[PDB]
Design an enzyme around this catalytic site. Structure first.
Site, PDB file in Angstrom:
ATOM      1  N   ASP A   1      -2.412  -5.091   4.985  1.00 57.80           N
ATOM      2  CA  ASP A   1      -1.584  -3.725   5.202  1.00 57.80           C
ATOM      3  C   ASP A   1      -2.198  -2.670   5.768  1.00 57.80           C
ATOM      4  O   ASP A   1      -2.993  -2.080   5.269  1.00 57.80           O
ATOM      5  CB  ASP A   1      -0.801  -3.565   4.046  1.00 57.80           C
ATOM      6  CG  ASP A   1      -0.019  -2.734   3.928  1.00 57.80           C
ATOM      7  OD1 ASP A   1       0.306  -2.026   5.027  1.00 57.80           O
ATOM      8  OD2 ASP A   1       0.579  -2.124   2.927  1.00 57.80           O
ATOM      9  N   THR A   2      -2.186  -2.719   7.269  1.00 62.61           N
ATOM     10  CA  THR A   2      -2.867  -1.582   7.781  1.00 62.61           C
ATOM     11  C   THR A   2      -2.275  -0.092   7.683  1.00 62.61           C
ATOM     12  O   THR A   2      -2.999   0.631   7.953  1.00 62.61           O
ATOM     13  CB  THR A   2      -2.921  -1.899   9.482  1.00 62.61           C
ATOM     14  OG1 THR A   2      -1.423  -2.046   9.853  1.00 62.61           O
ATOM     15  CG2 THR A   2      -3.501  -3.010   9.765  1.00 62.61           C
ATOM     16  N   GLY A   3      -0.983  -0.264   6.950  1.00 57.49           N
ATOM     17  CA  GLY A   3      -0.579   1.119   6.639  1.00 57.49           C
ATOM     18  C   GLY A   3      -0.797   1.456   5.219  1.00 57.49           C
ATOM     19  O   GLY A   3      -0.264   2.670   4.938  1.00 57.49           O
TER      20      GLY A   3
HETATM   21  C1  LIG Z   1      -3.233   4.815  -1.050  1.00 60.32           C
HETATM   22  C2  LIG Z   1      -1.800   4.077  -0.431  1.00 60.32           C
HETATM   23  C3  LIG Z   1      -1.509   2.757  -0.849  1.00 60.32           C
HETATM   24  C4  LIG Z   1      -0.354   2.086  -0.194  1.00 60.32           C
HETATM   25  C5  LIG Z   1       0.385   2.665   0.793  1.00 60.32           C
HETATM   26  C6  LIG Z   1       1.642   2.391   1.217  1.00 60.32           C
HETATM   27  O1  LIG Z   1       2.577   2.087   0.234  1.00 60.32           O
HETATM   28  N1  LIG Z   1       1.624   2.199   2.406  1.00 60.32           N
HETATM   29  C7  LIG Z   1       3.193   1.870   3.400  1.00 60.32           C
HETATM   30  C8  LIG Z   1       3.363   2.789   4.517  1.00 60.32           C
HETATM   31  C9  LIG Z   1       3.380   4.276   4.199  1.00 60.32           C
HETATM   32  C10 LIG Z   1       2.310   5.072   4.067  1.00 60.32           C
HETATM   33  C11 LIG Z   1       2.220   6.161   3.723  1.00 60.32           C
HETATM   34  C12 LIG Z   1       3.185   6.835   2.955  1.00 60.32           C
HETATM   35  C13 LIG Z   1       4.356   5.983   2.661  1.00 60.32           C
HETATM   36  C14 LIG Z   1       4.368   4.880   3.358  1.00 60.32           C
HETATM   37  C15 LIG Z   1       2.981   0.356   3.662  1.00 60.32           C
HETATM   38  O2  LIG Z   1       2.112  -0.015   4.728  1.00 60.32           O
HETATM   39  C16 LIG Z   1       4.388  -0.339   3.992  1.00 60.32           C
HETATM   40  N2  LIG Z   1       5.389  -0.351   2.731  1.00 60.32           N
HETATM   41  C17 LIG Z   1       5.396  -1.846   2.406  1.00 60.32           C
HETATM   42  C18 LIG Z   1       4.540  -2.123   1.651  1.00 60.32           C
HETATM   43  C19 LIG Z   1       4.050  -1.221   0.170  1.00 60.32           C
HETATM   44  C20 LIG Z   1       4.739  -3.649   0.977  1.00 60.32           C
HETATM   45  S1  LIG Z   1       6.407   0.679   2.797  1.00 60.32           S
HETATM   46  O3  LIG Z   1       6.141   1.735   3.556  1.00 60.32           O
HETATM   47  O4  LIG Z   1       6.940   0.810   1.475  1.00 60.32           O
HETATM   48  C21 LIG Z   1       7.885  -0.149   3.667  1.00 60.32           C
HETATM   49  C22 LIG Z   1       8.852  -0.873   3.423  1.00 60.32           C
HETATM   50  C23 LIG Z   1       9.939  -1.545   4.152  1.00 60.32           C
HETATM   51  C24 LIG Z   1       9.788  -1.069   5.345  1.00 60.32           C
HETATM   52  N3  LIG Z   1      10.896  -1.616   6.274  1.00 60.32           N
HETATM   53  C25 LIG Z   1       8.924  -0.166   5.992  1.00 60.32           C
HETATM   54  C26 LIG Z   1       7.886   0.183   4.958  1.00 60.32           C
HETATM   55  C27 LIG Z   1      -0.065   4.101   1.135  1.00 60.32           C
HETATM   56  C28 LIG Z   1      -1.263   4.763   0.662  1.00 60.32           C
HETATM   57  N4  LIG Z   1      -1.653   6.080   1.326  1.00 60.32           N
HETATM   58  C29 LIG Z   1      -1.527   6.307   2.713  1.00 60.32           C
HETATM   59  N5  LIG Z   1      -1.721   4.989   3.458  1.00 60.32           N
HETATM   60  C30 LIG Z   1      -1.498   5.593   4.899  1.00 60.32           C
HETATM   61  C31 LIG Z   1      -1.179   6.933   5.251  1.00 60.32           C
HETATM   62  C32 LIG Z   1      -1.140   7.806   4.057  1.00 60.32           C
HETATM   63  C33 LIG Z   1      -1.048   9.367   4.245  1.00 60.32           C
HETATM   64  C34 LIG Z   1      -0.556   9.822   5.783  1.00 60.32           C
HETATM   65  C35 LIG Z   1      -0.094  11.239   5.905  1.00 60.32           C
HETATM   66  C36 LIG Z   1      -0.453  11.905   4.922  1.00 60.32           C
HETATM   67  N6  LIG Z   1      -0.963  11.658   3.605  1.00 60.32           N
HETATM   68  C37 LIG Z   1      -1.362  10.306   3.351  1.00 60.32           C
HETATM   69  N7  LIG Z   1      -1.449   7.415   2.786  1.00 60.32           N
END
Ligand SMILES: Cc1ccc(C(=O)N[C@@H](Cc2ccccc2)[C@H](O)CN(CC(C)C)S(=O)(=O)c2ccc(N)cc2)cc1Nc1nccc(-c2cccnc2)n1
Ligand SMILES: [Cl-]
Ligand SMILES: [Cl-]
Ligand SMILES: [Cl-]
Ligand SMILES: [Cl-]
Ligand code: NA
Ligand code: NA
EC number: 3.4.23.16
Lengths: 99, 99
Positions: free
Chosen positions: B25-27
């Site tokens: 998960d690059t996000g």
């Molecule tokens: C520590 C951590 C752990 C998990 C996640 C995470 O759940 N990532 C998400 C993306 C995301 C990133 C930031 C905020 C909301 C959503 C993940 O990559 C994609 N998700 C699915 C996965 C949990 C299975 S999602 O976002 O829930 C999702 C579900 C359905 C669809 N169609 C699109 C996205 C993010 C972080 N933190 C993080 N990661 C990336 C950017 C930032 C950020 C950006 C800007 C300001 N502050 C923090 N913060």
């Protein structure tokens, strides 16, 4: 390009005539963009992840230029904390994970 | 490997002698795993996802194998929907995004 992962993989996109910053997100099935207007039909959808679900509008057949590469597909619009380019459009620009 | 994105980028991981499935998960800034027993002390962390925030337990310097690649680093444990390998460990295994 080759994008390392020391930092968030942010790129510039162009969508609906607007420039936005978005995360290249291999963990996202679909592309999700913060609130904006798009043309054409939509239908409601719920999407879930860490912290639960949000309601979004699903727009099909939307063109997006991602770091200079054009792709067409579904775009979900709603109260995402971050603009996300998900797999549905990453495939179209030929993005792969390599190690 | 070179992993395309037509399907979810699921891999097997090994942690605490147990095999699990996880999403590359690059996000995700940080790796987050479903409830399990890990050794040592933990520290609190709040992470923000699509739906809002969850509290997780942060365990540092944890031995984890990802698609056969050995890593040692931070693992967050909490109510995530899927096990996710975030950038902190994707960098350890030498992963890049390419297009
Ligand atoms: C520590 C951590 C752990 C998990 C996640 C995470 O759940 N990532 C998400 C993306 C995301 C990133 C930031 C905020 C909301 C959503 C993940 O990559 C994609 N998700 C699915 C996965 C949990 C299975 S999602 O976002 O829930 C999702 C579900 C359905 C669809 N169609 C699109 C996205 C993010 C972080 N933190 C993080 N990661 C990336 C950017 C930032 C950020 C950006 C800007 C300001 N502050 C923090 N913060
Ligand atoms: Cl699509
Ligand atoms: Cl391909
Ligand atoms: Cl966070
Ligand atoms: Cl780490
Ligand atoms: Na449409
Ligand atoms: Na520890």
């Amino acid at each position: 390009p080759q994008i390392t992962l020391w930092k968030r993989p942010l790129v510039t996109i162009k969508i609906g005539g607007q420039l936005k910053e978005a995360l290249l997100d291999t963990g996202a099935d679909d592309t999700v963009i913060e609130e904006m207007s798009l043309p054409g039909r939509w239908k409601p959808k719920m999407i879930g992840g860490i912290g639960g679900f949000i309601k979004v509008r699903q727009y099909d057949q939307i063109i997006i230029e991602i770091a200079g590469h054009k792709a067409i597909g579904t775009v979900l619009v709603g109260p995402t904390p971050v603009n996300i380019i998900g797999r549905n459009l990453l495939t179209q620009i030929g993005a792969t994970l390599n190690f």
